Amino acid sequence: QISVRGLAGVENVTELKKNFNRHLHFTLVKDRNVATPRDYYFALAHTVRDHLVGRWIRTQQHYYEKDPKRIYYLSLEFYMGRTLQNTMVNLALENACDEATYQLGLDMEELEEIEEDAGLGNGGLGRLAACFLDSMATLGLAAYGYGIRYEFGIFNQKICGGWQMEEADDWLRYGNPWEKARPEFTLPVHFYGRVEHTSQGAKWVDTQVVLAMPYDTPVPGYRNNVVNTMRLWSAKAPNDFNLGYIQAVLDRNLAENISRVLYPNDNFFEGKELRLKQEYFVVAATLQDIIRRFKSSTNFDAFPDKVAIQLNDTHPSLAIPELMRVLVDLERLDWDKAWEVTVKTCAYTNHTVIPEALERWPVHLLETLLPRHLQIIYEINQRFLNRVAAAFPGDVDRLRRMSLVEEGAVKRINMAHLCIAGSHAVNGVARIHSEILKKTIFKDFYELEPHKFQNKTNGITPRRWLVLCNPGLAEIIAERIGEEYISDLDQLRKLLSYVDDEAFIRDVAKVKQENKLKFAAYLEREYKVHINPNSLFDVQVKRIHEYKRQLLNCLHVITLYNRIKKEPNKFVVPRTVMIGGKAAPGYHMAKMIIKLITAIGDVVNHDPVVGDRLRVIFLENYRVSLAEKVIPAADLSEQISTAGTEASGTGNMKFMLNGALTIGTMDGANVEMAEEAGEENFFIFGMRVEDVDRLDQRGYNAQEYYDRIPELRQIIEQLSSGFFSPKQPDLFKDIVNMLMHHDRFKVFADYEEYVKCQERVSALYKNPREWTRMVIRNIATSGKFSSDRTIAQYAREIWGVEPSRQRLPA
Amino acid sequence: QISVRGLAGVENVTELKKNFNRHLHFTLVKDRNVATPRDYYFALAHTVRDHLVGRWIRTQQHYYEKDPKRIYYLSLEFYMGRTLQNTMVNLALENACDEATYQLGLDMEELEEIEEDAGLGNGGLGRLAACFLDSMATLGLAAYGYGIRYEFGIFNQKICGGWQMEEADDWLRYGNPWEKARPEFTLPVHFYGRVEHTSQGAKWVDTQVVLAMPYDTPVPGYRNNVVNTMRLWSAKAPNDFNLGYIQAVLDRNLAENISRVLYPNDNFFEGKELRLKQEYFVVAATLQDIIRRFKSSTNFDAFPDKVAIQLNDTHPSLAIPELMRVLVDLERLDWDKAWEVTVKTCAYTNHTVIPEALERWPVHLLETLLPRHLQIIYEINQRFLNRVAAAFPGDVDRLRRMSLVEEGAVKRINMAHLCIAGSHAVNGVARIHSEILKKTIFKDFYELEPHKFQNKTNGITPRRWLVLCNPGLAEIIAERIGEEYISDLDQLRKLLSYVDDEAFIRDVAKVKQENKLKFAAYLEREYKVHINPNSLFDVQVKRIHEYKRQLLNCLHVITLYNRIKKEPNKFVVPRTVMIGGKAAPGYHMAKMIIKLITAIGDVVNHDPVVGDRLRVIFLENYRVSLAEKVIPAADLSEQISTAGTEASGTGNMKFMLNGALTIGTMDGANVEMAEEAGEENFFIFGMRVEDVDRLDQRGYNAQEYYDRIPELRQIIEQLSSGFFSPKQPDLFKDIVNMLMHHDRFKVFADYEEYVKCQERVSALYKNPREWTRMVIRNIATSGKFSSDRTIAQYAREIWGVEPSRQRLPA
Ligand SMILES: *Cc1c(COP(=O)(O)O)cnc(C)c1O
Ligand SMILES: *Cc1c(COP(=O)(O)O)cnc(C)c1O
Ligand SMILES: NC(=O)[C@]1(O)O[C@H](CO)[C@@H](O)[C@H](O)[C@H]1O
Ligand SMILES: NC(=O)[C@]1(O)O[C@H](CO)[C@@H](O)[C@H](O)[C@H]1O
C-alpha cells in the first residue's frame, strides 16, 4: 500500500467487507458459489456508492440552506470514463477497499477492468467537461452538469483487415450503479407547432410533446466531502402518444430516438434534424429545471445573481432564445428587461476556429421545428444590428458580416454570432486561440464589445490524470513534498530543487520503466502484441483528423524505416511508435489514414532487417480508460497540429504531467506549456501561425517540397507505387492526391524541421540521466495546467463566485 | 390486527423499521424531508424483497442438489397484478409491516395503492398462469414460469364521451423492484435465413440474430419458505447489428420491438408477423435454457424423466418442432428417438373452442420466418397421417380433416393439430369443455388416441383471492375452523355446520356490508360516483365479448328501467348494476357495447322518477387490482355466456369464494360450481348446450322472439329510435342489426328465462337471513376451485411428480 491511497483502518476494512457480502447477497442475489468477476465488481461498486449518498444528500441540503449562486454547465458531451477508482480516490477509500477485497480473496485491479467506460463524448471537448465537474466539486462550487443520457455513446472501434469497423457502445447493458433515475422530476419539451399572436402575447401552440426524464450521477470533490450533481436527460414519449393500436405503441420509439445515440463527430458540423432536436431537448428541460429551482429559493432581476449558465461551445446556444421565450412569453417580462437578464446570465466558450466545425443551421429547419425561436432570433438580430449601425455608421459590409442571419444558397443562422450577442462573456481555451478569435473570426465583435472577450486556458484534473492513473509517480512525489499538491498542483514547482537529486532521478526513471513494462504486458494480454520495453515509446493518441496531422507522423515513421534499410548495420535509438484514435464514421480521409498506419506496420513489423529497432502499433479503441494506461507509459508525446488549428489540446497536458517529453508545434496550449517549462526543455519545430499566413498569402505549393527533398520524394513514390499495398497498388491514391494538390494543413511544409527535431529527441534519449532531468523540469512546471486553476478563473472572472477548499462535515 | 395476518414481533418490527430507513437513505437516496408517498412505497418494497432473496437462493440451490423433475410452464401471458401485499401474505409479514409502517407514521394501505399492476395478460388465460405459479410454489414443485417481459402490458382504459380510449401501459416507468436482470444468461434467437442440406444433416443458415435477455422474478409459496422463479425474456439487438452509422443504431429498435407490447386480443387470433416472432422468441430462448439446465444436472432418453413442458394454449406450440430441430439437427438424434422424447416431454392445454380464436398460421409466413421449422412440421404431418391411414384404411376425408396442413385460399398450419400430435396429454379446462373437445373439435384425434385426452378444471389461488382481497372474511372463517384452509380450501366444507349459526350469519353479512361501504367510498374517491350501499350489487366484470353477452345484461337493465317507468310507485329491490371490462382495440362491436352501457347509464342515472332504485355504472379500467376491490363487494355474480362458449371461466370462482350468489348458464365451470353447492343454491337459467344445438339444427330466428315478447320489442324499438342516443338517433343501428339478423350467440333466446330468474334473485334478497344462508352454502362448497387442487392433478396425472407441503428451512 502507498501513502497517497489513504488508510486501511481496522474498523473500515471490516465494515467494507460485510457491506460487500451484503450487496452480493441482497443486491445481486448471488452466493459465492455462482458469483462471477462481474458480480464482484458490482458488489464493490454498490459498497463504495453507499459511502457517497450520505455526503450527496448533505451537500444538496447545504446548498438549499445557504442558497449560493448556482453554476449550470450545459454540454451535449460528458466523457466521464470509469467511476469506481475515481470515487475511491476522492473519498480516500482506495487502500481500505484494496485490503478488504484482498481479504475476500479478490484482486481489486481485476474488478476495476470490468467497469464499462461512460463514453458520452467524442474526445477533448467532452473530457474537458468531465475534468471541470471534478474541479468544481473540489473547489466547493454549487455546480450542476446538464446533458443527455445517450443510450449509446461513442462507438467501440474494431480493426478488421486494417480498416476501422464501428460497433454500438451498449454501455448500459449490465446496468449503471452510479446513476439514480428521478422519474418524479420529468419535464415536457415541445417541438414543431405554430405561433399564435393574440391580444397579450405570442403563444406557441399545436406542439408535439416529448418528456425529459432526469438521471442524476454524483460528482465527488477531492476529500472535502462535497458531492455535486450531473443530471442527464432521457427522452420519453407521453402515454397518450400516437394515442392501429400496436403501431402507435411501436412508434413511441420515434420520440425516444432523441436520446438514443451520440453524434460521433469531432470538430465537424453535420446539420441533421435529429441533432438539432437533441440540442433543444437538453436546453428546454434544463432551463425549466433552473427556473423551478430559482423559484423555490419572483423578480428575475436577481436571476443573474443566483444563476450562471455556461455554454460549452454553441451546441446549447438555443438556451439564449429559449430563456427569452420563457421570460417574455410565459413570465411576461418586457423584452428589454428579459434581454438584460439573459445576457448577464449567459457566458459562451468557443472551442475551435475551423470553418467545418462552426454551427450554421438552415432557417427552414428552425422554421419547422422551432417557429417561435426563429422569430425571437430575428428580433435579437434586428436589435443587435441597430447597435452595430449606431456604432459604425455607414459600414454596411460590417452589418452583413456581423448578422446572425447568413444569406446565400440557403439562409442559415450563425450560432456563434447568436452566442456572442447574448452572452456577457466569451472566452477561448488557450492564450493563442483567444487572440486568434479577436484578430480574425470574431474581430468585428471584439471591436464592438471588447470587454466581453477573455481567455481561460484549459486544464486537466490531477486526480484522474496523476493519482489515479500513475500512483507510482504520485507516491515518489508525495515522499518529497507531501500530498497537498493533489489539490494545489502549483506546488509541483518544489520538485525543481530535486533536479540534481540522484535519488529522485533514479526513482522518476524507475516509475516510468515500471509503467512501460506494465503497458507492454497489457498489450500482449488483451491484444497479443509483443513490443520491446527498452525502446523509446513514441505516442500519438487523439481523434483521427487531418488537422492533427497523424500523416506527418506517418511520413516520419517511413523515413526511419527507409534510413534503416539504407544502412542496416548502423545504430539507431530503438522506438515503438504508437498511434491510436477513432475516425468519425463518415470521414473518409480519416478512415484512409488508419488503413495507412496499419499498412505501414504490416511492412515494418515483419521486416527481418529492422528487428526490434522499430515497431509500428495502432492502438485500437482509444478511449478514456485506455488513455489512463498508455499516457503514464509514454516517453515522447506527439502534439503536431498545424499552427493555429488546435484551439488548446488537453492530451498534451496529460503527457506532461506523467513524465513524457513533448515534440510539437507552437499551437494551442503547447505555447504556454513551453513557456512554463522553458523552450530548452521542449522539442518545438515547424511554422508558427505567422509563417502559415505568409505561406497562404503566397500560395502553398506541395510540389516544391517534393522537388527539393529526396527523402520525401521517395516516400510519395513508395505510396504511389503500392509498396505498402501490394495487392492494391493504388489503394492510397486519394492520400497522395490530397497531399500533393489540396492539403489544407501543409504536411510537407513542416516535414524537414520535424524530422530534424526527431533526431534531437533520439540524441537526448541516448543520455538517460539528462533525459530524466528534462522530464523532471516538465513535471515540476505542469502546475498551471490543473483544471482547478482553470475553474478558479472562470469562477472569479466570469461567474462571480469565490472558490472554497473548506471541508463539509462528515 | 387480525390473526390470519401473522405476528407483529417486537424484534421484527424493529428490524423492519431500520431496514426501511436504510433503503430510503441508501437505495432511494432520499431523506424524510423530500420523500413522497411513492418513495415510501419503494422503501417498503425493497425491505420486503430482502426477506425473499435468502429463501430464493436456498430454494434454487436445493433443486440443484436434489435434482427433481423440473416443470416448465410456457405462456405468452402472465397477469400477475401487484406483488407487495401478496409477498407479505406468503411470508407472514403483513401485520409486522403494518405495525412498522404505522410506527413510522405511514399508512401501509395507502402505499400499496401506489404499486403498478404487472399487466402482462389480457384476462382469464393470463390470470390462470399467475394463479398456477402461486400454487406450484405452495405445493413445492420445482416449477419455472417462462414468458416475455413486455415493455407495455394490457392498455389502460379511459372512457371519453362514453367511448373507450386506449393508452400505453408504461408499467416500468418508475422501475420494477421485484425483478432481477440476468444479462449474463443472454441467449441468441434466430430468424429468417434458409436451409442447407449437406452430407450429414440440414443446417439453418444466413439467419438474423436477436438476443434474449432474461429477467427473473421470485414466486413465493405460502409460508413454506419455497420461492420459485418466473423468467421473462426481453429482446436485445446484437452489438454488430446493422453494423449510415446513426441509422444503423436507430434501426436496433426493429429487433427489440419483439418484446415491446402485448397483443390485446382475448379469444381472437390475429395472424400478424410480429406476433409469430414473439411466439418463436419465447420458445427458442426457453428451450435452450431448459437443455442447458438439463446438461448441468447426455442421453436424452432421461430427458422426459427430468423435464416436463406445459403448453398454455397453442401460443408456444412451436416448442414441438423447435425441440425436434435441436435434437435432430444439433444433437444428431435419429428422428424416431427425438419424436419419442418430444412427445413424452410435451403436454398441451386447450382454452377455447371458438373458431376465431384458433391459431392457423399461413404457410408463406412460416416459410419466410422459420424455413427449417416448416420442413419439420411437414415431416411430422407426413408421419402422423401415415398413422391415421393405418388405423382407418380408406377414410380419406378423415385424412384431410386431421392434417396439420389446411388447404384453401392460402395454406395454413393448424397449430392445435400440431399440439395434439406432439403431446402425450391434451386437456380441457372444465368438465363440459373437455367433453366438448372429444365430441366435436377434436373428435377424430380422440378416436385415434383416446388415452391422451384429459380434463383439469381450472381454479384460483385462495391466497390472493380471499386472504389478500378479503381479510375480513378470511378472519371470521379462521375464527371457527382455523387457518389450515388457506392451503387446503376443501376444509371450508366445515362451515356447513354453521349455516344455522346466528352469530356466523351475522358476521358473514357484516363483512359483506363493510366491503360494500369500502367500495362505495373508493368509487367516489378516485371516480367521483355516488352509489347506494344498501342496494343489491349486481356485477359483471370480464373482457367485453359478444359470447360473454354483456348485451343480455343490458337488455335486463333496460327492462327494469321500463318497468319502473310504467309503475313508478311500486316497490322494487334497489340495485346497483356494475359492468366493467376492456374491449380489444380492433373489436368494433365490443367498443359499441361499451358505448351502449354508458348511454344507458346516462338516461337511467339521471331520471328523477328512478331515484336511488336503479343505477348503471361502467367500471373503468378493469384489471387485477380492481378485481380485488369489486369482487369482495359483490352480491350477484353475472356469468351468462351462451352455453358451450366459455371454456371454464375463473371470475365465477372468485365471486363464489367471496360471498356473492351466482346467476348463470350451465356453461364452463358454472356446471361444476352448481354441482358442488347444489342447484338450489345457484340461479341457473337458459339453454343448455343441447338446446343450443337443437336451435342451430332448425335455424335461429331472432324475429320470432321479437314478435312474441312485448317487453323485448319495446327495448329494440327504443334502441332503434334513438331513445338512448338523442343527438345520434341511429348510433346503435349496428347493434340492433346484429341482434336481429346475425347473432351467433342467441341473446334473445335466453332473454325470457334470464329476466324471470333475475326476479327470483330480487325475491331472495328481500329476505336477508336466507340470502346469507345460501351464501354460506356457496362459500362452504367452493373448495374444489382452489388452483392447489388443479395443480395437484396436473402434477400427478400429467407431469408425473408428487406435490409436497413440507416447509423448507428458514
Ligand atoms: C484527453 C483526451 C482527448 C483529447 O486529446 P488531444 O490530444 O487534446 O486531442 C481525447 N480523447 C481522450 C479519450 C482523452 O482522454
Ligand atoms: C379473473 C379475471 C378475469 C377472468 O374473468 P372471467 O369472468 O372468467 O372472464 C379477467 N380479468 C381479470 C382482471 C381477472 O382478475
Ligand atoms: N473543439 C473541440 O472539440 C476540442 O476538442 O475542444 C477541446 C477542449 O477545449 C480543445 O482542447 C481542442 O483543441 C478542440 O479541438
Ligand atoms: N381462452 C381464454 O382466453 C380463456 O380466458 O382462458 C381461461 C383460462 O382457461 C378460461 O377460463 C376462459 O373460459 C377462456 O375464455
Curated annotation (Swiss-Prot), chains A, B:
Broad class of enzyme this protein falls into: transferase
Protein name (Swiss-Prot/TrEMBL): Glycogen phosphorylase, muscle form
UniProt KW Phosphoprotein keyword: yes
GO-annotated cellular components: skeletal muscle myofibril
Record's comment on post-translational modification: Phosphorylation of Ser-3 converts phosphorylase B (unphosphorylated) to phosphorylase A.
Family to which this protein belongs: Belongs to the glycogen phosphorylase family.
UniProt xrefs under Pfam families: Phosphorylase
EC number: 2.4.1.1
Site (Can be labeled by an AMP analog): Y144
Cofactor: pyridoxal 5'-phosphate
Modified residues (N6-(pyridoxal phosphate)lysine): K654
Function: Allosteric enzyme that catalyzes the rate-limiting step in glycogen catabolism, the phosphorolytic cleavage of glycogen to produce glucose-1-phosphate, and plays a central role in maintaining cellular and organismal glucose homeostasis.
Keyword check for Hydrolase: no
Highest taxon in the source lineage: Eukaryota
Binding site for AMP: D31, Y64, R292, R293, F294, K295, S296, S297
Regulation of its activity: Allosterically regulated through the non-covalent binding of metabolites, being activated by AMP and inhibited by ATP, ADP, and glucose-6-phosphate. The activity is also controlled by post-translational modifications including phosphorylation.
Self-association and partners: Homodimer. Homotetramer; to form the enzymatically active phosphorylase A.
Residues with PTM Phosphotyrosine: Y192, Y215, Y446
GO BP annotation list: glycogen catabolic process
GO molecular function, one term: nucleotide binding
Site residues, Involved in the association of subunits: C97, C131
Modified residues (Phosphoserine): S3, S403, S487, S720, S721
Gene3D superfamilies xrefs: Glycogen Phosphorylase B
